[PDB]
């Protein structure tokens, strides 16, 4: 009758008041996603063990002080379920390490906990875990006594407090006994200090690795061209990375817009170049139109975007993120369940709203809006339809 | 195909070379005993979780330096299986915490690691865990600058190095999610210093708790009377205790003899008093005679003894230990298997020798003698026949 | 111009917010007392180093939750200066270990931080550090599921919350490179649970060690006899101990009264037996009369008492504690300085009120009362006049 | 009569056998150098505190396994004294972090301990401590599964084990309360893997920061051109860096040769360009000639070199290191003392050999050769003569 995987904590003493108190906040919920993800029972205890030892210490002060970037609310963790064509669902963790020094004189922009977690991650003997590529992006996006101007930017009159993080993490739990670790970099602060357009140094970040190896040039240079033509990738734009070897690496470019017209959604997904040359973009966009209409956003909608550059191709796979905070979680659960019948997905369609009340039995799906925050869409020829749902990740 | 419960370590980094090396030495073997005990899979991960975090650090330096008392060889851990009439077998761990200070100028007699582990065990919220009774026995057997005379005893000419330990622990894994913790006290050192017979201050130790609560007097005074009449309980004698509340507490007195005649085993089991007054003593001794003859010690045999004092009675339950190191592990596996048919034990009889090659697949039961070290015998009216086997507890 | 000894912290990162945050509260003040006590500069850094590594971590959560017993206000540390005839002043620290578990379900009465601090102390190779005697007092005053009745006592209607501590520590920093460690025991909780008079089990605690060694019986039995005749040593009565070897051990019995008449101060100091048999009692009481009159308590006064039993004698040396919180610290500075001229003390008299403004430069001696809380008096033939002043031990 | 600064350790318990055991090896010697450097007594304790907490734990296993690069013998630490014209001598520490994982499958080339120590150095709030520049040089010289080919290089037939380190640290203790941190990079391994000349990728390392800021181009290209014309900078060449901000940064290029003729020493110091344009090179070389002849290397002498690039100039300051291991430390103490009279140094000349027996009172300057290993020479217009002596840095 209770959630199963959380019985490891029975014989564990959390050394600090900070950790025991966070466990009390998220340990229950994480055990429920492992049950939802249908992971092997021995698998769930492995990922629990990792969660207790590396992420609980990394949350830092329980009454938190850091406003994280990766989460809508600000708390430094969010959980996600990756829904895949006719196959077991997966679990995504993206979170930012924090300590009591975060936001202080010593580390006003959370650089220290990032490398603290990254050192433990390397100590963990992880299959095919290589840091050279992510380390390159930090070296480009570090800041020296740019901090002084950043300390100076804190003006109430001139709003200069959108985001303060400088990097973050992501953890994917595949059904095998493996974590793929995914890392993030946030250029707003480095460009804010240099008085240089946010995207201009994103290109150099890619070009500096281009002289190292030059397989991202074509795919990326095509992204810049649209973003220069467009309103432009702005303060909210940022970057992603995988901690795997470079040849297998899949780097991404994120960004945000408040412009919500279907025409603009078509303008970004298609742009110019990628429309003609491949059918997936066209095929995927069609299926993207029906979820846009299934999820009536109630105004008749600011969105995040993503282009996934892979070296083994010259066609970046687009991915968009969709507002569900503000939309009824049942309306979305119902409407999101229909879209699986439209694609012909056998079980996920029927058991999702019953796997949604199961994840939050305390709360009432009738009245909740914030239990579901964002939805991602991606389309590949081989993979079919990618789609992941980001949830409310704290119990309170 | 591999042993299951050890997959927690996949995402764990053992902080010190000392621990990783101990893991490499016993981590495989402990996970095989959990499979042997037929514990629930979530149970096995709980007991592994405990094993990794409290016992691996507690072993100290891998190329060890402390010779422990609790083990035939000296290594500070031994695993044991509790076989019970027609029911699931249980797993016993008895081990002594050690550090690099053990045996040094700072702690020449392993007192500091005992209190170190005992603080952590209390931190872990354990059901019905009360230390006052064990704390009493430590306080009685402590030594202040008796250490100086003890430092002085180290003479090659006058042999004065039989045992150096001062206390130890025991961990019982019942099929529920619970550990019963069992503690030990070693009087040889305190008695060696005081130049006082080893047993006389065992008696004051019981009498000091007798004024606190006086339910052990009858049973215990009956033991002393036999031991005073007898050759006496000697240097090897020592004391046992449970970390539960006093009312439910079951304290034990162990000891050793090299006198091996069946008559002397009968003298010890019966003595005088406990023969007439209760039948279990007579019943249990009868079943004990056939295993004595099944296990031909090949000389036609030094043995350990135990008397279990329970307050809710005035009849201590005897328990003997039998040498199997030196006896063929196959011959013992076979002969121990016949004795279960004589008692009519349904499955334990047939699957024991196949659960013995399973525990040591690397080794050959054909030729091994040291895989099985001791066997304990106990008989109660309610429980029937208690019997446990103590095994070779290191991989090398 | 600044306090000197606090420059070790420059290259130290306090691991927790709790510690750095406690440092900010007490580190400045502790450096000022080392300057006051006129310790060697190499001496001051040794004691600073100890204070940082063992005492700051042991305070636990900074917004404290534990009300300690040893301090007037409740915070778990107090500093004290030992003034001695024509010689360098000394510095006393008495404090109680705390964690976030203190007062929780797991440890509702601070027993765990006591043994945590005690294990580290034994790790520090301290000259002539033997714990067996204090361990004896803890075993006697431990409580097993008396905790349940203690959990049950928390009634607002029947007041049952005077004191919750179970033991505490005290540290004396002599002018040599040595700490003498002093321990405390608090019988209120053990006696409250057993429904047994507080002093009756104090007698057994002394008698249980009397069979071990019987040199405190005479001096102590003389203490019981007066306290039985008197109003009696009450809930507030409690016990003290030194961590040195038993032969050099100097145990004490403290207690409290609200009865403030000079006759009653005389009744306790003299009692019956110790008046006639030694003149020091007579000599010391006289000098004690003038400080009582120098220190007009403004009502024309609850006081603490102490009897120090030494095995090398049969005459316990008394010591009383006097309220100064509520009395103007300047009035106390002036009048305490006059009493040194009455004894003829060369420098302590002249430089005390200037060593008082130096210790609290932020505050105004003109208006402060709580900066000086208690003053102790003792008289020995050999030592002359003992007297120590307890101070306000936090910056805020 | 004893060395003073090591009295902090009295109240410190080194948690691991590895640390206590290293302290016993180097703690005495480090305390004697602080007395030699004539630092303030409160200063020496600050620096001792830092050495105890940050460099002792970083040494890892005491019976070491890692052969470091920065040290002649191989042990991962060396101490050095900076002798300067008519002013207090300074203390240099260069040491490489190590753990039991160093040289393992997990980290076969010591990258993990480098980043561990670098995080702590950032946690300690140090004046003007900026890592972006050092981080840049690591990202360029990292290796991902170049390790596989490096794992493959370990052939006894083709010698491929000159150096295995990838980076190291340096600590400068100035007479104020401040440490300047200096970092090192070892290109041999990265170029060995890429099958690319060791120097060609040093140039890209400088050019990649040149697009970031372009003030090292002129000076550095002047070094490359000489090194290309010359026999060339080889396997032993490596790179140096300061942890200060870029504008004040002083980067260095080191290297080694076995070619020992005075003429070749003249070729390297002068080369072509820097001869004409500035006289310091000419003046400094003159003074260098007499120490070459004072120190008759006994063969009638492989040397290390250094070129210091400062952005605020276009003239790199040379520095050479001279073999003293193999030369009598007294012959060196005497001959090094004459050279101070030649420059007119008031006290350093007279008190040096008496400050040398003081550092090694155990050993006999009469017969020792290995107590003094290398001597560095530098000449500046503003600074005059730089010279530092590298010593035998372990007790055994």
* DSSP per position, B13-47: --SSHHHHHHHHHHHHHHHHHHHHTT--HHHHHHH
Closest CA to D183 of D258, D225, D235, D122: D122
Helix axes A329-343 and A279-294, enclosed angle (nearest 10): 140
Q: Where would I find the beta strands (DSSP E) of A235-292?
A: 238-242, 251-257
The chains found to touch D (3+ Cβ pairs under 8 angstroms) are: A, B, C
Q: Do residues C252 and C307 touch, judged by C-beta distance below 8 A?
A: yes
Structure solved via: X-ray
Contacts of D16 in chain B (CB under 8 A): 16, 100
Q: How many folded domains does chain C comprise? A: 1
CB atoms A10 and B177 under 8 Å: yes
The answer to whether position C396 is within a domain reads no
Domain presence at residue D93? yes
* A396 lies in some domain: no
The C-alpha atoms of residue C51 and residue C38 are separated, in whole angstroms, by 17
Q: Does B61 touch chain D (CB under 8 A)?
A: yes
C100 at A interface, C-beta within 8 A? yes
The parent domain of residue D127 ranges over: 5-391
CA nearest to A256, candidates A391, A72, A75, A98: A72
C100 vs A61: CB contact, 8 Å cut-off?
A: no
Task: Name the nearest CA neighbour of B169 among B111, B117, B101.
Answer: B117
Q: Is D45 annotated as a binding residue?
A: no
> Rounded to a whole number, what is the distance in Å from the CA of B135 to chain C's nearest CA?
6
User: Contact at 8 Å (CB) between B292 and B265?
Assistant: yes
Please name the residue of chain D whose CA is at the shortest distance from the CA of residue C127: D10
The verdict on residue B396 lying in a domain is no
Sign of the CA dihedral running D365, D370, D372, D377: positive
Q: Does A247 fall in a domain?
A: yes
Contacts of D173 in chain C (CB under 8 A): none
Q: How far is D100 from chain B (nearest CA, A)?
A: 6
Closest-CA residue to A353 (of A344, A341, A343): A341
Is the separation of the CB atoms in A19 and A56 below 8 Å? yes
Q: Are A13 and B120 a contacting pair at CB < 8 A?
A: yes
Q: Which residue of C has its CA nearest to A21?
A: C100
- Measured CA to CA, the distance from residue A123 to residue B314 in angstroms comes to 57
- Please give the Cα distance from B313 to B248 (Å, whole number): 11
CB D383 within 8 A of CB D395: no
Q: Taking a C-beta distance cutoff of 8 angstroms, is the pair D138, D167 a contact?
A: yes
Q: Is A41 within 8 Å of B42 when comparing Cβ atoms?
A: yes
State the residue for tokens 């190590």: D98
What gap in Å lies between CA A281 and CA C215, rounded to an integer?
Answer: 94
Does C391 appear as a known binding residue?
Answer: no
- Tell whether residue C360 is among the known ligand binding residues: no
CB < 8 Å to A11, chain B: 46, 49-50, 53, 124, 179
Q: What is the spatial distance between Cα C60 and Cα C22, in angstroms, rounded to a whole number?
A: 9
Residue D387 lies in a domain: yes
Residue among B17, B61, B100 minimizing CB distance to D100:
B17
C257 forms beta bridges with: C303
Taking contacts as CB-CB distances below 8 angstroms, the residues of chain D near A118 are 115
Scanning chain C, the segments in alpha helix (DSSP H) are 17-36, 41-50, 112-123, 132-141, 146-152, 188-194, 200-212, 217-229, 262-270, 273-277, 280-294, 329-343, 348-357
Q: Rounded to whole angstroms, how far apart are CA atoms A149 and A194? A: 9
Q: Is B390 annotated as a binding residue?
A: yes
DSSP-derived letter for residue C83 is E
Q: Cα D88 from chain centroid?
A: 20
Q: Is A119 on the interface with B (CB under 8 A)?
A: no
**Nearest to residue C183, comparing CAs of C207, C167, C166, C204?**
C167
Separation CA D123–CA A115 (nearest Å): 12
At C237 the three-state DSSP class reads coil
- Short-list D371, D291, D306, D376, CA closest to D339: D291
Annotated binding residue B85 = no
CA quadruple D196, D199, D200, D206: dihedral sign: positive
Give, in order, the Cα–Cα distances in Å from C43 to each of A377, C7, D5.
Answer: 68, 14, 11
* Tokens coding C81: 């200066």
Which residue, chain included where needed, has tokens 């994917």?
A: A172
A to B CB pairs, distance under 8 Å: 53
CA-based nearest distance D353→chain C, Å: 28
CA distance B187 to B198: 7
Query: Whole-angstrom Cα distance, residue A150 to residue A146?
Result: 6
Closest A-chain CA to D141: A132
Chain C partners within 8 Å of B139 (Cβ) = 132, 135-136, 138-139
Instruction: Give dist(CA A374, CA B337) in Å, integer.
Output: 63
Residue A366 is assigned to a structural domain of this protein: yes
**CA terminus-to-terminus distance, chain C:** 22
Please say whether the beta carbons of C200 and C146 come within 8 A: no
How many beta carbons lie within 10 A of that of residue A155, not counting itself?
9
**Resolution to 1 decimal place, in Å:** 3.2
Spell out which residues of chain A touch residue B177, defining contact as CB-CB under 8 Å: 7, 10
Cα separation, D265 vs A144, in Å, equals 39
The whole-angstrom separation of Cα B291 and Cα B239 is 26
Neighbours of B153 (CB within 10 A): 14
Residue A382 C-alpha from the chain's centroid: 22
Q: Do A132 and D144 touch (CB under 8 A)?
A: yes
How far away is chain D from the Cα of C179, in angstroms, using its nearest Cα? 9
Contact call for A139 and D139, based on CB within 8 A: yes
Do residues C301 and C261 make contact, with C-beta atoms less than 8 angstroms apart? Answer: no
- Asked if C135 is an interface residue toward chain B (Cβ–Cβ < 8 A), one would say yes
D116 at the A interface (CB within 8 A)?
yes
Contact between residue C160 and residue C151 where contact means Cβ atoms under 8 Å apart: no
Chain C residue numbers with beta carbons less than 8 Å from the beta carbon of D42 are 4, 7, 41, 45
> With left for phi above 0 and alpha for psi between -120 and 50, is residue C87 left, alpha or beta?
beta
Q: In this complex, is the C-beta atom of D371 within 8 Å of any C-beta atom belonging to chain A?
A: no
């Amino acid at each position: 009758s209770p959630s199963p995987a959380q019985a490891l904590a029975s014989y564990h003493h959390f050394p600090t008041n900070d950790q025991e108190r966070w466990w009390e906040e998220t340990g229950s919920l994480f055990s429920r996603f492992l049950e939802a993800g249908q992971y092997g029972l021995p698998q769930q205890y492995q990922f629990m063990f990792f969660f207790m030892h590396h992420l609980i210490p990394a949350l830092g002060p329980y009454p938190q002080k850091w406003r994280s970037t990766i989460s809508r609310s600000g708390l430094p963790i969010e959980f996600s379920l990756n829904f895949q064509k006719g196959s077991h669902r997966l679990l995504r963790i993206g979170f930012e390490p924090v300590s009591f020094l975060s936001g202080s004189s010593q580390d006003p922009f959370n650089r220290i906990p990032i490398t603290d977690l990254l050192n433990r991650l390397s100590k963990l003997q992880l299959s095919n875990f290589d840091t050279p590529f992510f380390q390159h992006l930090l070296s480009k996006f570090q800041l020296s006594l740019s901090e002084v101007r950043q300390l100076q930017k804190q003006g109430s009159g001139p709003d200069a407090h959108p985001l303060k993080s400088q990097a973050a993490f992501g953890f994917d739990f595949n059904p095998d006994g493996a974590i793929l670790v995914k890392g993030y970099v946030f250029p707003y602060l480095k460009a804010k200090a240099a008085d240089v357009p946010v995207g201009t140094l994103i290109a150099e970040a890619v070009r500096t690795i281009d002289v190292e190896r030059n397989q991202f040039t074509h795919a990326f240079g095509l992204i810049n061209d649209y973003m220069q033509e467009s309103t432009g990738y702005n303060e909210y734009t940022f970057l992603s990375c995988d901690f795997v070897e470079t040849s297998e690496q899949r780097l991404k470019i994120y960004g945000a817009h408040t412009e919500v017209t279907w025409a603009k959604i078509a303008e970004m997904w298609t742009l110019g170049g990628r429309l003609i040359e491949e059918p997936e973009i066209i095929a995927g966009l069609a299926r993207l139109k029906q979820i846009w209409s299934l999820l009536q956003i109630g105004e008749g909608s600011p969105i995040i975007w993503n282009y996934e550059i892979h070296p083994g191709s010259r066609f970046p796979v687009p991915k968009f993120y969709l507002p569900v905070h503000g939309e009824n979680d049942l309306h979305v659960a119902r409407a999101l369940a229909q879209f699986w019948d439209s694609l012909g997905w056998p079980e996920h369609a029927c058991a999702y709203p019953d796997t949604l009340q199961q994840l939050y039995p305390d709360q009432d799906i009738s009245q909740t809006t914030r239990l579901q925050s964002w939805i991602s869409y991606s389309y590949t020829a081989k993979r079919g339809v990618y789609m992941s749902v980001y949830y409310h990740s704290q119990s309170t």
